[PDB]
Amino acid sequence: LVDRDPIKTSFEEWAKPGHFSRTIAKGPDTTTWIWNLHADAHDFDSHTSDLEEISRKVFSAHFGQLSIIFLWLSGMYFHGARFSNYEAWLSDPTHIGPSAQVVWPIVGQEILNGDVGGGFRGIQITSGFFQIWRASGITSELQLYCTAIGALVFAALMLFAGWFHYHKAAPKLAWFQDVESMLNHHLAGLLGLGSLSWAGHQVHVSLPINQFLNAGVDPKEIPLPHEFILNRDLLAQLYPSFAEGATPFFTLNWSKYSEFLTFRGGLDPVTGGLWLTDIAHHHLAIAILFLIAGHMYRTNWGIGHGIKDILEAHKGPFTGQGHKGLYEILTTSWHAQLSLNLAMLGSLTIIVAHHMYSMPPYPYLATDYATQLSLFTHHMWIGGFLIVGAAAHAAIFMVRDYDPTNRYNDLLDRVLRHRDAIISHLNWVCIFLGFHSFGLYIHNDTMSALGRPQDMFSDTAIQLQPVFAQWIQNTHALAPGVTAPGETASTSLTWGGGELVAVGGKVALLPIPLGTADFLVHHIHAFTIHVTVLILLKGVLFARSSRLIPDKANLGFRFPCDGPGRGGTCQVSAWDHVFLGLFWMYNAISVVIFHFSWKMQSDVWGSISDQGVVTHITGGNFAQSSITINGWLRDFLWAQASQVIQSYGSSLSAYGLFFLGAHFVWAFSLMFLFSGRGYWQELIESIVWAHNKLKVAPATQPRALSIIQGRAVGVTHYLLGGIATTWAFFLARIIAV
Amino acid sequence: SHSVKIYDTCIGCTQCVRACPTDVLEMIPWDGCKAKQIASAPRTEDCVGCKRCESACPTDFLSVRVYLWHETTRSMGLAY
Amino acid sequence: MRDLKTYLSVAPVLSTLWFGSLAGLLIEINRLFPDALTFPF
Amino acid sequence: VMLAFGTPEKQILIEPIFAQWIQSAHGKTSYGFDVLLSSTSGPAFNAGRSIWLPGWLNAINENSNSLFLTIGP
Amino acid sequence: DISGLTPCKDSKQFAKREKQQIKKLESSLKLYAPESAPALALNAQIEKTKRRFDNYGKYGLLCGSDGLPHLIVNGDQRHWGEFITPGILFLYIAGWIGWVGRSYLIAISGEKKPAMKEIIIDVPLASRIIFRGFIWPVAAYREFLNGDLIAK
Ligand code: CLA
Ligand code: CLA
Ligand code: CLA
Ligand SMILES: CC1=C(/C=C/C(C)=C/C=C/C(C)=C/C=C/C=C(C)/C=C/C=C(C)/C=C/C2=C(C)CCCC2(C)C)C(C)(C)CCC1
Ligand code: SF4
Numbered sequence A: 001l002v003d004r005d006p007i008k009t010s011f012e013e014w015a016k017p018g019h020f021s022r023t024i025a026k027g028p029d030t031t032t033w034i035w036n037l038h039a040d041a042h043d044f045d046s047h048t049s050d051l052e053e054i055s056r057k058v059f060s061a062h063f064g065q066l067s068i069i070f071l072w073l074s075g076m077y078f079h080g081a082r083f084s085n086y087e088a089w090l091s092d093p094t095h096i097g098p099s100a101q102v103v104w105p106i107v108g109q110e111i112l113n114g115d116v117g118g119g120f121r122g123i124q125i126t127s128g129f130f131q132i133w134r135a136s137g138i139t140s141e142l143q144l145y146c147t148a149i150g151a152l153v154f155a156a157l158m159l160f161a162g163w164f165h166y167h168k169a170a171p172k173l174a175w176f177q178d179v180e181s182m183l184n185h186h187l188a189g190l191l192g193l194g195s196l197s198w199a200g201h202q203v204h205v206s207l208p209i210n211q212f213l214n215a216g217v218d219p220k221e222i223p224l225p226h227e228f229i230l231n232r233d234l235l236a237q238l239y240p241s242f243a244e245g246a247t248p249f250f251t252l253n254w255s256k257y258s259e260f261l262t263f264r265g266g267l268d269p270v271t272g273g274l275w276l277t278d279i280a281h282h283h284l285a286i287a288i289l290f291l292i293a294g295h296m297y298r299t300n301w302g303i304g305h306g307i308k309d310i311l312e313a314h315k316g317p318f319t320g321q322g323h324k325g326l327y328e329i330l331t332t333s334w335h336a337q338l339s340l341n342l343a344m345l346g347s348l349t350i351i352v353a354h355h356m357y358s359m360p361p362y363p364y365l366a367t368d369y370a371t372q373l374s375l376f377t378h379h380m381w382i383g384g385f386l387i388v389g390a391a392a393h394a395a396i397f398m399v400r401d402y403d404p405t406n407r408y409n410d411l412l413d414r415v416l417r418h419r420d421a422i423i424s425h426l427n428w429v430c431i432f433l434g435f436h437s438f439g440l441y442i443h444n445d446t447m448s449a450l451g452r453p454q455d456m457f458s459d460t461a462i463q464l465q466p467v468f469a470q471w472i473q474n475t476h477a478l479a480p481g482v483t484a485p486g487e488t489a490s491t492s493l494t495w496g497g498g499e500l501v502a503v504g505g506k507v508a509l510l511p512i513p514l515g516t517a518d519f520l521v522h523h524i525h526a527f528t529i530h531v532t533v534l535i536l537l538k539g540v541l542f543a544r545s546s547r548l549i550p551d552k553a554n555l556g557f558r559f560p561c562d563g564p565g566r567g568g569t570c571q572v573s574a575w576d577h578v579f580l581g582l583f584w585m586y587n588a589i590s591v592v593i594f595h596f597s598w599k600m601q602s603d604v605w606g607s608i609s610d611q612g613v614v615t616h617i618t619g620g621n622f623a624q625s626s627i628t629i630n631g632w633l634r635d636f637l638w639a640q641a642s643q644v645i646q647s648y649g650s651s652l653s654a655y656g657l658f659f660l661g662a663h664f665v666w667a668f669s670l671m672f673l674f675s676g677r678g679y680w681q682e683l684i685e686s687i688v689w690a691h692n693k694l695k696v697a698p699a700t701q702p703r704a705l706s707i708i709q710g711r712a713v714g715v716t717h718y719l720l721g722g723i724a725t726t727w728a729f730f731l732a733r734i735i736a737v
Numbered sequence B: 001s002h003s004v005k006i007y008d009t010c011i012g013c014t015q016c017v018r019a020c021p022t023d024v025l026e027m028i029p030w031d032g033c034k035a036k037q038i039a040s041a042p043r044t045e046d047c048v049g050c051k052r053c054e055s056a057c058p059t060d061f062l063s064v065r066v067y068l069w070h071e072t073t074r075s076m077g078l079a080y
Numbered sequence C: 001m002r003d004l005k006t007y008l009s010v011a012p013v014l015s016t017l018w019f020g021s022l023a024g025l026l027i028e029i030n031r032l033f034p035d036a037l038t039f040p041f
Numbered sequence D: 001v002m003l004a005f006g007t008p009e010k011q012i013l014i015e016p017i018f019a020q021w022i023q024s025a026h027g028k029t030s031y032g033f034d035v036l037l038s039s040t041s042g043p044a045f046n047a048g049r050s051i052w053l054p055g056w057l058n059a060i061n062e063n064s065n066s067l068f069l070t071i072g073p
Numbered sequence E: 001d002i003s004g005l006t007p008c009k010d011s012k013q014f015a016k017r018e019k020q021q022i023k024k025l026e027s028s029l030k031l032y033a034p035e036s037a038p039a040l041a042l043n044a045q046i047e048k049t050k051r052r053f054d055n056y057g058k059y060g061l062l063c064g065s066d067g068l069p070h071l072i073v074n075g076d077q078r079h080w081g082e083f084i085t086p087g088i089l090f091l092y093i094a095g096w097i098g099w100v101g102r103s104y105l106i107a108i109s110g111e112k113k114p115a116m117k118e119i120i121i122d123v124p125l126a127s128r129i130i131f132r133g134f135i136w137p138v139a140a141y142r143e144f145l146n147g148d149l150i151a152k
């Protein structure tokens, strides 16, 4: 199912911009043509109506994405070998700050090459690559150079594959629609075999090298990874069970492998991370489970399941026919699959962000506060963006590919017939949550201002205790020995076990208390999430029609309005709902990251002394100061911003410059959001007049930006400015202290 | 009700009546253009004011003009 | 190739080349004569 | 940017010469321009030296009030 | 002493600023071995700072009460290098750029599809036009005198 040489390789189409569209290829009468060229670059569905060609175009771009990712990985690995102090950091991870970037001295920018330890001058990095390299057994820079070379080779291979599968042998449509085979392969081979290979690498390389490192041996005296394979005596000395070979595995005497395959739980006191034996056992079990899961769906040999057969058998007295017809929708529309995958990926990213901080998987990662904060905020933002994109593409599918005549589905029909109740109930829930979550903050502020601290919602006057979460913490703290007999310690130290882990005089992790403030902040999170969901679902559900504009589907997915009639019809399209929900996503993620930062700085992170007294960074003021808006403004925003505003003249002045630059970018966006196109089109007419006077009027007539373009520019600049401000503030605050 | 007017720069291409979301505009015979036609607005009480007619006029400046005026239950598009 | 030369004359590529050469020249000039506040000649 | 890199002497600081000249024309002696009312031998100073110039010059040359404050870049 | 300013070479605050910067730079040098590359970089930075301060002292700038140089733009011949000469150079360069752009725009105005020559530049024609802007003042003045500069 491939075609030989579908499209000739030529430079002819390079010299004719806009060849993908008939209208754009005509020529640039005005300046709107240039903007329209870029906005429709990757909309393959608008270029042609053939599903096979769209699938072939989609298949090739992923190869370019993979090549770009491989180039990025190659650069990251190469910079750590040539412009880094990784070897010096390896001998003292607790007193040296990782750095992998140096700057050329031209205009006085060499001040950014601050001292970081190990006789090195550079920029301190917070991506956590040093911990990953240490956990993999990497010791010298030659291995990093080899990894960079391999990544370059893989990027070249990906680029060649991308060219080949589009210009020499393009698969047919019947190849793409083999969902059962694709699922079987991506489950058994992509995931299970990868987990098995990583488990093997961890067993044979990471474990002995990491044990030698934790023993305190000089990294230059540790035997090379290949010495543990050729010389089984070394492994037998390290692990006696290796002397028996693979015989216990094939005789089901798996108890002999308990030395390097454990079920301990908790953190390693030496490094502050999870035990590597637990990780190896976890990867082995996950590989087995994924290998089993990949033999469910039917193929050329009869045995297995048919996804259509599974779907068609589920229906209920409330839902009618049920899931019949969903198989044909998901195997014919690219947008629905994209929306579902984007939503699932965003949720998974948020879950990963939440899980990484409380269960540190890398050595010397819990005590690196900047890395933890950066990873948390980065992954949360990525998850939010993916979640928004899911709804955007769901609306796109609803507008374009919906067709009840040939693709009828009962479940989709029933949802669209009672959307008013869903929207009204969601509106009521949002209003109730906003009143009963944010209103308690204003009450506390008013009572504090009036001089009545005894009438506030606080731990000392009127308690609002999160009794349900405390019960979960108590249950999980008592899990070992009762409901998890095979475990020695709890999964996390934050459950409330009472034990504290200190590495290098710093607090890695300890139980986290929950009080009245956590109740309020959690309900604030719920309120913001509910409002965002309301906006996106209202946008998706009313994409085709409404009581105001019955024929909204004919106007398309991205149109500005339908005139000033009916009192005003501004921003009625589904695109405008995504444009509006991006702001609320930004708001929710900012509140969440502020909560995380303040809570960790106030109740977890700190230093321990010889007598064992913990002194936190901010002194534990979160409980009594976060219950008012004035407290958030004073003890968090005003107090913690002194690091970034006093960074001039030092190696951290770049963050100080980025603070003001992001301020300017954020403030600059309000011009596009608060104004309209007619004023700017009328203003241009006067500017064109004087150019005509001096014979400098261009033939490409200048036109003001369209309404949609202006809204997009405004939202983009707004988001960029806000995120850059928060990034600069966080990094400047956390690197110094 | 809104006010809709037609001016004698009409060329009678029937583009405004086809874009009308309600039944407001119509064509009548005329003399003064090649097409021998001109538009008319006999049912302005059904006008909503979305101004789709002006988006379809090919004449340099519009031969059909809509002036927003006193609002009723029909011109506001309410189905309460 | 005529079509390859045509693609090199498009606005973004020409602008990128011009600005790269310009930035290189300015950086070299500032490297040769650093910290200039007044015109002494 | 000059302050960020730790070299404050690279700033572009420009004196408000014209406003300082105007201030000196009113009798202020903090810039050493010596023009008009700041010059004791000019016709303008000699004309009004016996009516209002003493009090105005006393008030303008005292640096605690808000009368013609000193200016800079 | 214009507006009560003092020369850089006679200002004590200027020397204090130089000493403070040098002392701040020398503190980080004690953390590294003399043969190490960061020591060489810090030595070069110290030498550059000393050279910059000496050059500022030599050029006859004026310092304020804070020990910072100030620029006089009123037209005094003693300070024509701060504003006048760079201004003339900038005016010449900007006129060159504008004249080249206007000439290129005028040249392609008579073509069948002039908008196509604006997104895809006619490189030989532009290159032939680029060198012409070196004498832009004379051409502009003579075009103004003949009444060709302003569109009718
Ligand atoms: C797997 C991820 C994925 C994929 C494959 C797609 C794919 C697609 N999306 Mg999409 N989208 C995604 C995620 C994704 N999206 C997410 C997460 C969101 C939410 C933010 C959206 C929101 C979204 C909207 C709102 C729209 C699409 C549209 C489209 C289609 C046309 C794309 C196009 O023309 O863009 C062209 C690409 C660009 C113009 C580049 C944008 C430049 C960015 C925004 C600025 C970057 C700033 C940068 C840092 C500054 C450096 C600049 C430099 C020059 C100096 C295409 C099928 C469009 C569509 O289907 O219309 C019918 C459409 O209207 N998407
Ligand atoms: C060579 C082309 C050219 C020329 C001769 C002029 C000339 C003029 N412009 Mg102008 N302008 C241009 C391009 C040009 N513009 C472009 C491309 C833009 C869009 C960014 C503008 C935007 C603009 C505004 C918004 C305004 C002017 C104004 C003016 C007048 C005041 C003088 C001045 O410095 O304004 C300032 C000039 C600028 C800020 C323009 C920026 C410099 C551009 C980027 C140079 C680009 C040149 C171009 C690449 C030529 C390529 C040549 C190559 C093919 C060989 C003056 C008649 C002002 C006026 O009096 O209103 C009528 C005014 O308010 N211009
Ligand atoms: C249109 C631009 C513009 C505007 C609105 C102002 C407005 C103002 N200036 Mg001002 N100024 C300008 C340009 C401008 N300036 C330029 C370009 C220079 C440098 C020469 C100065 C230098 C300057 C000084 C030194 C002082 C002011 C001050 C003031 C304030 C008091 C009024 C006054 O003295 O007028 C001044 C009006 C002018 C100087 C006219 C300039 C307008 C022309 C058309 C600009 C053309 C530039 C020209 C091409 C340069 C050629 C030089 C070349 C030969 C090298 C007032 C707010 C005073 C103040 O109160 O500061 C606190 C003050 O002391 N200005
Ligand atoms: C880091 C990195 C890199 C590299 C990588 C690598 C180097 C990898 C490797 C990998 C590997 C190297 C893998 C492997 C694998 C293997 C496997 C997967 C196997 C399997 C096997 C099996 C499954 C078997 C089974 C069995 C049974 C069951 C029964 C009978 C017996 C036997 C044994 C046969 C690069 C440069 C790219 C860049 C980026 C980053
Ligand atoms: S009103 Fe406009 S569209 Fe209708 S006939 Fe006249 S010119 Fe044509």
Ligand code: SF4
Pocket: A565, B004, B019, B020, B021, B022, B024, B025, B046, B047, B048, B049, B050, B051, B052, B053, B054, B066
């Ligand atoms: S404004 Fe709208 S409703 Fe009124 S006549 Fe025009 S198209 Fe019809």
